[PDB]
Amino acid sequence: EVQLVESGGGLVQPGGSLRLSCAASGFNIKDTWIHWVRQAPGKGLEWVARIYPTNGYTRYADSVKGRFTISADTSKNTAYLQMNSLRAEDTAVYYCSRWGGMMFYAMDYWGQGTLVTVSSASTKGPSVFPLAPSSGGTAALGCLVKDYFPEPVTVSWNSGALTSGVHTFPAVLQSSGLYSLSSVVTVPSSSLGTQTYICNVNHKPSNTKVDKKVEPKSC
Amino acid sequence: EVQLVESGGGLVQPGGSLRLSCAASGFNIKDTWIHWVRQAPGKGLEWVARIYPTNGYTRYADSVKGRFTISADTSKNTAYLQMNSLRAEDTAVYYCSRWGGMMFYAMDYWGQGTLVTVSSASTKGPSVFPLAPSSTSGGTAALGCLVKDYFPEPVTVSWNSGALTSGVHTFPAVLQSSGLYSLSSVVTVPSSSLGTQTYICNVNHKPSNTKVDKKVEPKS
Amino acid sequence: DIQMTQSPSSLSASVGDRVTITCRASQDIPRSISGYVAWYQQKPGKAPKLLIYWGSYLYSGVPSRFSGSGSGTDFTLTISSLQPEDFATYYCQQHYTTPPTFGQGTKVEIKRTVAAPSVFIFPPSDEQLKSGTASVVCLLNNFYPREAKVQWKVDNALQSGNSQESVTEQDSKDSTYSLSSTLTLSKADYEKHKVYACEVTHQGLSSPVTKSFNRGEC
Amino acid sequence: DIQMTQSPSSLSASVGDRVTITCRASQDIPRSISGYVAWYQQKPGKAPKLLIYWGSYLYSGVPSRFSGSGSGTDFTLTISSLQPEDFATYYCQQHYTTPPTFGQGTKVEIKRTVAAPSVFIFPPSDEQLKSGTASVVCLLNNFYPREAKVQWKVDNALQSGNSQESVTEQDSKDSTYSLSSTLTLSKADYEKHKVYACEVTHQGLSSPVTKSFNRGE
Ligand SMILES: [Cl-]
Ligand SMILES: [Cl-]
Ligand code: NA
């Protein structure tokens, strides 16, 4: 139960500022070193910063010097990344990690990451539309989650009870500047008269939750 | 109460082998790294080896690679240095040390060091003779002990089992043409104290297992 | 300055194969300077996991099929018997420098037996048509290999430039992929035409398969 | 390989003076590679003690008169106001490489005012005489500077070649030295002569001082 939990990511305008937190449990950051690493969408890992909280010693990647400051509060067992003068190309998932023991040069525990989107576009929640199963085989159905910004959206089916045969596709960026994704599932054709299928869509950035029942279309 | 205490040094023939130990207390070696550093008589520090006890990783200076081996035994909170095929140039005080915390690259605690003497000569325990106060300056008298004809180094001397430290000079040993060492330890004290205060030099030469307590006083 | 170059930049290999990935320092470095090379595995939507540290040590809990080694300024990760769950991008990391740097990553995909997609087409919903736009979706489900072609036709006109595709990550249990192709039309265009068809080409199908529907027909 | 060149190899200064020791990396090393330079102090007979780590961090408990700085591949340790207790040899240490290496060391000596020695002479003990040898010891206590001349005379014959001197390291409180000279004789020769004299010349004595005894008095 060593654990690192990030927070504070979200959408911010170019030139803006944001502060990330990394809350540690099951160990004391006093004992060790904490790092930040980021990953732009579709790209590789880029080392960002590190700190030794006991004496405040810090090192930065050239790409963030002067703009980002890593800090820690050992009395709250939390580290921070204060990010200023943000640009588009700072857009990424930001992870914090540590070294443990006296095992230097090995990031053994990582947080789950928090997304930072640096953009002028406004927040927009999605519309959800059905992908109705058509006319003893297997049938497909799904939900189309259209026109949202920023990422991410999550989708579950029947509140988490339906996970087999579910595919939730990576979002695509449309030329409008908005994202869209679909989630589909295959099910037994004979279940269609009788079993209820609902997709649960959550776009936390616009606080939009939608549960969409998807069924055969009547005719 | 963080401490490191070496043992196992002393005399060894050229070609021979010796194993040192470093016993830790006040922290666990599992948590950190342990190093050995040595110093030849009158020279500088030379790094020897390092180990991460938790997984056994080790590195060595070129000068000892293939002859020394560093190891550790985490259940005894102890690290070791096995030294083989010793030569004259291995003659040195060997210190162990550690890193603490996650403060890499800084040896924060060191042991007291242990002298390894690589020589064909045999051990010889010293004689202890008094340097009796006659002598006197103002109302200050000097006295001491002469620790004569021993091999190898080192000898330690204390006065009144640690109770007397002021005005004590213990001289570096001198190598006589016989090939044996000799040292004195002296102390200045009040002439008036001579009648009534007891002065005892405590001499220890571990290589010959010679411990001596010698009372020094005005002659006849 | 010092950088690591991994190779290959991607590869595919069958379950039970032995895979090796290389990481090379971009310049000569004295033997006296240690790189403490680490290797990480990153699955889709997850933080990286440490596999190997200080060149060849196995991190606690990591399966034994993983091992690392390094001769000079060249380092290797080896997976001795590739499992389907090993689909991931793998990164090396060098600590000659401060900041340390990561290699560019090596994408590993599991080769399995060819599997044809099941193909489904979905018309736009009447709810969406109200809004002025029509999305038509074609789904290719659970296929291998990843390469596939999808062609849209509307009353026999090939559609070009008005569709986008998305592909799932390789499945960690069956090693298949799924893919969606979404055709976007205005409502008015959608209503001027009758036959909507997606034609799929894939190695597991002996010739192209079409699914279609006629607008307004049940 | 990569090494540290420390300078000077020795220096002296007065209490209250500012002193600077320098370590330079033996070669051009890329700036992407960190040295994590440490500094250690080593007093006579003792293990080294950590003073500064990672170039400029003061280790816990170290007096604030010590400081470290680094620029490129040049590193210094500065003592802002030298105290008597700072008599020691100081070593830098670089961690560009594994294994890390130490500089060659810098001896810091303390300058102070002239102090004449007190001188004492010790006949051989009767216990030693039983074994066949006689050692006569002359002691010069707490003097400065180190230079001193001690001459032995036996019934007025200058003794030459049959004595050995030992000198302590400068004292950590008063910065003085002490010195023993030991004259070795056979018991048979000790017993043929009467007057044993140690003559001491030192800058703090306006003329030489003699301490002597007569055997059996
Ligand atoms: Cl790292
Ligand atoms: Cl070190
Ligand atoms: Na056909």
DSSP sequence for A27-95? S-GGGSEEEEEEE-TTS-EEEEEEEETTTTEEEE-GGGTTTEEEEEETTTTEEEEEE-S--GGG-EEEE
Give the end of a domain, one of D53, D86, D112: D112
Distance from CA of D32 to the nearest CA of A (A): 11
Question: For residue D59, what are its two tokens?
Answer: 């280790």
Q: Regarding the domain with residue range A121-219, which homologous superfamily does it belong to in the CATH classification?
A: Immunoglobulins (2.60.40.10)
What's the Cα-to-Cα distance from C177 to each of A142, A169, C147, D47, D75, rounded to whole Å?
A: 17, 11, 10, 65, 58
Contact residues for C111 (Cβ-Cβ < 8 A; gap 6+): C12, C13, C14, C17, C175
- Between the CA atoms of C85, C88, C94 and C97, what dihedral angle is there, to the nearest 10 degrees? -140
Give residue limits of the domains in chain A.
1-120, 121-219
| Spatial distance between the Cα atoms of A177 and A148, rounded to a whole number of angstroms | 9
Q: CB of D37 within 8 A of CB of D92?
A: yes
Do D85 and D154 lie in a common domain?
Answer: no
- Measured in Å, residue A2 CA sits from the centre of ligand 1 at 18
CB-based contact B32 A103, cutoff 8 Å:
no
| H or E segment to which residue C100 belongs | none
| H or E segment to which residue A119 belongs | none
Chains B, C: CB contacts under 8 A, how many? 3
Do C93 and C132 lie in a common domain?
Answer: no
| Spatial distance between the Cα atoms of A169 and C44, rounded to a whole number of angstroms | 12
Task: Give CA A90 to chain center in angstroms.
Answer: 15
Interface test with D, best of B65, B169, B170, B191 (most D CBs within 10 A): B169
Q: Regarding the domain with residue range B121-220, which homologous superfamily does it belong to in the CATH classification?
A: Immunoglobulins (2.60.40.10)
Q: Which residue of A has its CA nearest to C123?
A: A131
| Spatial distance between the Cα atoms of B58 and B36, rounded to a whole number of angstroms | 11
Q: How many helices and strands (H and E) does chain A possess?
A: 0, 18
- Other CB atoms closer than 10 Å to residue A19's CB: what's the count? 13
Contacts of A52 in chain C (CB under 8 A): none
Q: Are strands C209-214 and D4-7 parallel, antiparallel or unpaired?
A: unpaired
| Spatial distance between the Cα atoms of D126 and D134, rounded to a whole number of angstroms | 9
Question: For residue A97, what are its two tokens?
Answer: 């990690």
Contact residues for B200 (Cβ-Cβ < 8 A; gap 6+): B159, B160, B161, B213, B214, B215, B216
Q: CB of B210 within 8 A of CB of D204?
A: no
Which residues sit opposite C88 in a β-bridge?
Answer: C108
3-state secondary structure of A205: helix
- Other CB atoms closer than 10 Å to residue A88's CB: what's the count? 11
What's the Cα-to-Cα distance from D159 to each of B146, B175, D166, D187, D197, rounded to whole Å?
A: 21, 19, 17, 16, 10
Supply the CATH number for residue C88's domain.
2.60.40.10
Nearest CA to C20 among C102, C71, C90, C85?
C90
Alpha carbon distance, N-terminus to C-terminus of chain A: 55
Give the end of a domain, one of C112, C135, C154: C112
Which residues sit opposite D134 in a β-bridge?
Answer: D185
In chain B, which residues touch A (CB < 8 A)?
A: 31-33, 52, 54, 99, 101-104
Question: For residue C103, what are its two tokens?
Answer: 């290699």
| Spatial distance between the Cα atoms of D85 and D100, rounded to a whole number of angstroms | 28
Experimental method: X-ray
Do D150 and D107 lie in a common domain?
Answer: no
Q: CB of C143 within 8 A of CB of C204?
A: yes
What's the Cα-to-Cα distance from A148 to each of A151, A183, A216, D183, rounded to whole Å?
A: 8, 15, 26, 99
Task: Specify the residue for token string 């000790």.
Answer: D190
Give the end of a domain, one of D52, D77, D112: D112
Question: For residue B132, what are its two tokens?
Answer: 């009796």
3-state secondary structure of B155: coil
**Structural domains of chain C, count:** 2
Q: CB of D114 within 8 A of CB of D139?
A: no
3-state secondary structure of A123: coil
Instruction: Return phi, psi of residue B64, to 5°.
Output: -125, 0
Do D173 and D107 lie in a common domain?
Answer: no
| Spatial distance between the Cα atoms of D194 and C129, rounded to a whole number of angstroms | 130
| Spatial distance between the Cα atoms of B68 and B89, rounded to a whole number of angstroms | 14
- Other CB atoms closer than 10 Å to residue C38's CB: what's the count? 27
Domain that holds residue C160: 113-218
- Measured in Å, residue D95 CA sits from the centre of ligand 2 at 7
Please indicate if any CB of chain D lies within 8 Å of the CB of C1.
yes
Question: For residue B178, what are its two tokens?
Answer: 């016989």
Q: Are strands A172-173 and D163-167 parallel, antiparallel or unpaired?
A: unpaired
Q: Are strands D74-79 and D101-102 parallel, antiparallel or unpaired?
A: unpaired
| Spatial distance between the Cα atoms of C198 and C59, rounded to a whole number of angstroms | 48
- Other CB atoms closer than 10 Å to residue B61's CB: what's the count? 18
Instruction: Return phi, psi of residue B161, to 5°.
Output: 40, 45
Task: Specify the residue for token string 């193909």.
Answer: C119
Question: For residue B47, what are its two tokens?
Answer: 């790094």
- Other CB atoms closer than 10 Å to residue D149's CB: what's the count? 9
| H or E segment to which residue C11 belongs | strand C10-14
Length of chain C: 218
Q: Write C190-194 long-range contacts (CB < 8 A, 24+).
A: C190/C124, C190/C129, C190/C134, C190/C136, C190/C215, C191/C215, C193/C154, C193/C155, C194/C155
| Spatial distance between the Cα atoms of D35 and D58, rounded to a whole number of angstroms | 16
Do D6 and D101 lie in a common domain?
Answer: yes
| Spatial distance between the Cα atoms of B92 and B63, rounded to a whole number of angstroms | 14
Subunits close to C (at least 3 CB pairs below 8 A)? A, B, D
Which bound ligand lies closest to the C-alpha atom of C208? 3
Q: CB of B167 within 8 A of CB of B150?
A: no
| Spatial distance between the Cα atoms of B145 and B164, rounded to a whole number of angstroms | 14
Do C55 and C82 lie in a common domain?
Answer: yes
Taking the CA atoms of chain D, what radius of gyration do you get in angstroms?
A: 24
- Measured in Å, residue C199 CA sits from the centre of ligand 3 at 11
- Angle at alpha carbon of residue A145, lines to A206 and C150, rounded to 5°: 145
**Cβ-based burial of B39 (10 A; exposed 0-12, middle 13-18, buried ≥19):** buried
| Spatial distance between the Cα atoms of D206 and C23, rounded to a whole number of angstroms | 77
Chains A, B: CB contacts under 8 A, how many? 22
In chain C, which residues touch B (CB < 8 A)?
A: 54, 57
Q: Which residue of D has its CA nearest to A60?
A: D32
Distance from CA of C95 to the nearest CA of A (A): 7
**Cβ-based burial of A86 (10 A; exposed 0-12, middle 13-18, buried ≥19):** buried
| Spatial distance between the Cα atoms of C22 and C77, rounded to a whole number of angstroms | 7
Do C108 and C22 lie in a common domain?
Answer: yes
- Give a three-class secondary structure readout of chain D: CCCEEEECCEEEEECCCCEEEEEEECCCCCCCCCCCCEEEEECCCCCCEEEEECCCEECCCCCCCEEEEEECCEEEEEECCCCHHHCEEEEEEECCCCCCEECCCEEEEEECCCECCEEEEECCCHHHHHCCEEEEEEEEEEEECCCCEEEEEECCEECCCCEEEEECCCCCCCCCEEEEEEEEEEHHHHHHCCEEEEEEECCCCCCCEEEEEECCC
Instruction: Return phi, psi of residue B103, to 5°.
Output: -85, 80
| Spatial distance between the Cα atoms of A196 and A178, rounded to a whole number of angstroms | 30
- Measured in Å, residue B113 CA sits from the centre of ligand 1 at 34
3-state secondary structure of B138: coil
Q: CB of A9 within 8 A of CB of A94?
A: yes
- Angle at alpha carbon of residue D2, lines to D1 and D3, rounded to 5°: 110
3-state secondary structure of B160: helix
Do C137 and C156 lie in a common domain?
Answer: yes
Do D150 and D101 lie in a common domain?
Answer: no
Subunits close to D (at least 3 CB pairs below 8 A)? A, B, C
Does residue A126 have a cis bond before it (omega within 30 degrees)?
Answer: no
Question: For residue B45, what are its two tokens?
Answer: 């520090």
Do C128 and C102 lie in a common domain?
Answer: no
Return the sign of the alpha-carbon dihedral for residues D22, D24, D30, D36.
negative
Distance from CA of D12 to the nearest CA of A (A): 34
Task: Give CA C50 to chain center in angstroms.
Answer: 21
Does residue C48 have a cis bond before it (omega within 30 degrees)?
Answer: no
Question: For residue C119, what are its two tokens?
Answer: 């193909």
CB-based contact A184 C180, cutoff 8 Å:
yes
| Spatial distance between the Cα atoms of A80 and A36, rounded to a whole number of angstroms | 9
| Spatial distance between the Cα atoms of C26 and C55, rounded to a whole number of angstroms | 17
| H or E segment to which residue A21 belongs | strand A18-25
- Other CB atoms closer than 10 Å to residue A151's CB: what's the count? 18
Return the sign of the alpha-carbon dihedral for residues B51, B56, B60, B64.
positive
| Spatial distance between the Cα atoms of D179 and D168, rounded to a whole number of angstroms | 6
Nearest CA to B143 among D200, A190, A122, D137?
D137
What's the Cα-to-Cα distance from A27 to each of A74, B30, C62, C121, D105, rounded to whole Å?
A: 11, 17, 21, 52, 40
Contact residues for D80 (Cβ-Cβ < 8 A; gap 6+): D18, D65, D66, D67
Q: Are strands C74-79 and C66-71 parallel, antiparallel or unpaired?
A: antiparallel
Contact residues for A73 (Cβ-Cβ < 8 A; gap 6+): A79, A80
